[PDB]
Design a protein around this ligand. Sequence first.
Ligand SMILES: Nc1ncnc2c1ncn2[C@@H]1O[C@H](COP(=O)(O)OP(=O)(O)O)[C@@H](O)[C@H]1O
Lengths: 145, 750
Amino acid sequence: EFNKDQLEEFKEAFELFDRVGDGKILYSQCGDVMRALGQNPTNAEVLKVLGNPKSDELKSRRVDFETFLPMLQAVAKNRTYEDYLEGFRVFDKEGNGKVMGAELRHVLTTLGEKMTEEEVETVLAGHEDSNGCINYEAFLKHILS
Amino acid sequence: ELYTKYARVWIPDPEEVWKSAELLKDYKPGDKVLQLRLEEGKDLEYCLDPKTKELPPLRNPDILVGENDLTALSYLHEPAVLHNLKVRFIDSKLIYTYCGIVLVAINPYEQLPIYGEDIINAYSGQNMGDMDPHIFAVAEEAYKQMARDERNQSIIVSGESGAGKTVSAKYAMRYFATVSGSASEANVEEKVLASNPIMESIGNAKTTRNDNSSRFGKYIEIGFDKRYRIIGANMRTYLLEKSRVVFQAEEERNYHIFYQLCASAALPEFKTLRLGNANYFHYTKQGGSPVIDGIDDAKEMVNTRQACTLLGISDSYQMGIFRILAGILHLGNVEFASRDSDSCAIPPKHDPLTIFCDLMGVDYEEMAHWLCHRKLATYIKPISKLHAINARDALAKHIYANLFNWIVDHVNKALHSTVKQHSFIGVLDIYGFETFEINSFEQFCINYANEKLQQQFNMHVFKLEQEEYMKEQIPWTLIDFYDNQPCINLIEAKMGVLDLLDEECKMPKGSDDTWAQKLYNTHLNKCALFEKPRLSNKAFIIKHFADKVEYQCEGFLEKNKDTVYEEQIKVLKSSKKFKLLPELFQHKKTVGHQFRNSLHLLMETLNATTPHYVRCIKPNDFKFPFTFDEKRAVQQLRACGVLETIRISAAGFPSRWTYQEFFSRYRVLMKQKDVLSDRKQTCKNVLEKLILDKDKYQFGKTKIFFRAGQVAYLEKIRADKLRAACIRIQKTIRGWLMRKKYMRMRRGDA
Ligand SMILES: Nc1ncnc2c1ncn2[C@@H]1O[C@H](COP(=O)(O)OP(=O)(O)O)[C@@H](O)[C@H]1O
């Protein structure tokens, strides 16, 4: 699991997200942190660890680093690369690596854990030519680091 | 299995009949309750009926919803049809949809720009299945198949009164008129449409559920020459509600024309007719509903008379009709008084009878004699009080039937063509399954007719399925025919319901109660299409095509009697003040047997054609523009065969993709290697792996035939893939952008 040097690096990041000065964060923010610290949980994976909180408490329940930590752990002990390349291979109707811009935004904003168009904009910023095409390989490596 | 988390279903709803729901957790086998989410969020635990353990119907995936043809849908069941027709209607102003060979037409209650010349041309010379559904498309197919087979066509337009059957016909004509050559002084359309006010006055009436219901089948034949051009028309009537002429039940009137006559009583030209208001006459008062909200019966007369003028019933003859109808009306009030040895007689100098005889021009005394007497052949004999009344009504009914046939013969003269006729397309305007709370003889007759018609249709569809199944080389013995002959037979065979009724009638002592018991003795248990209310001995149940219908035996016998005394007709045939009254006229007759006759006559006519089908539907009960009541709609479908036809369809292989189509939408499910140079063959390999059980589809020359729920399953796994691929990329971007947001805020950017 985790040692002291790691506990300080994580608690440093954790207090940056405290927008009140109580040493705690909102239940909703827990997702942010985990991603900030190198993880990639599905919003579902996040919710399980929180307790599958109802919306009345997802915007009001605060948590110290002591209680956040088991949740950060839980996601740690459940998280390939080839299968990422095969997933983009799905949305590819040509074979040339080149995928439409309109058809990538669409699926990303109306499927699975739907993302806002603004989030989808900031990410695909400039990674597309005049024809509205994007070599996923280029894009896949970028997003991972 | 198929009921996984996030998949949706339809559960019952008192307001909207069905309501959507989503599965919160995967359905585990043997579970007692599902966990669902409604129109206001996650809330509810749906309980499964322990005796069936059955699950609620499944929703189709969106890519199949909104289609031009219901049979395209994988999960083909009541809510699916109901939803799918709702979204087209409400969210795309689309009133026409196919159900296989059937065109469903939902009354928009708003005029649309989809009937002009430009749109007619666009349908001109196209194939049905390459143009958006339209009444026009059904017309074009008729005109096509005509030449392509040297065969006359019947377009059969059915639906409840007010669903728009009349409007549908009106536009199928215009098509046929515009796409033919046009005739100059004919412009047939216009003449025929002027006939409508006439036919509606003598053939339509107010009922408990409808202000303007046709109580008959109209069949306008459109005549065509050797060079296929509109020359003339030919109206044929059938299935008339003779009973309605002397009986009405609560909140129902007699045929309009009688009321357009009373309301026109204080008019000059109509003073000889000598008419009060509608509460006066027995044959117009019985219902208690003298006036229809929002109709000036008098202004409708004005229009009625005007239409007679347009079709060439000379003003002289117009007075000829009204005069006969006045007499029928006075005839009605002839009261009878019982005398010694079960006989009767008419009170001295009877006001009603005097007026009846004056109008008709016959000897008062000769008639008064024959209303109470009978020729037992050659000894004269009196008749009881009740037999005189049955015979008075028999005569009122007989006259009307003839005057009704007369008007049709002379309307026809205005719609007839000198030019000889090669072929025709006839449009039938008929009713569908009637079903009130109290059902009587009138309804029984209607649904009898509808069982005859839904039998032709069943057959037609079965032959077309065969043909299509052959064109693709698929075992032709995989089509189960649903045979509705047992029910027809229960109704119309010997020892059947109409036959026993016709027996009990010629019994002197007979009654509705004994006829009810004779039905039980003869049929109860011996036949599964017949049942009996548990707490009544005065009502039966027949399981018809669409649903079950409890008839009430009260009234059946008297309505069914229709025996006219030969003497009474001779008195009228021998008139010398009325040119028309003789012109009408040229063991034991009965309304039921008569109905039957006309019915068979009609099914002949129609079997000497290839029929087309338009089912009309009223979507709401207040004439509202594009407004869809789910309660009304679903009623209207059931009593229209639709949901049952579809119930049949979903038994076989209703889904039908071409190999090209399958291949496109499902290239993505295939492992890149599986793909071959032969795309047809490729599909054969992939579909055997993805869907195991090989009884779930069949491979044809150019198309794959699927069982119900199967394409849905393809579209679930295809959905499952793309969903799992997206969640992957998404969680990644969610992380990339959170660390970019960190790296900034780490260096005090806030
Ligand atoms: N296609 C349509 N477009 C616009 N209005 C229609 C259409 N079909 C029916 N209606 C409306 O519905 C009413 C009833 O029409 P109608 O054809 O007379 O029904 P039906 O004759 O079966 O009793 C009409 O007055 C008309 O206003």
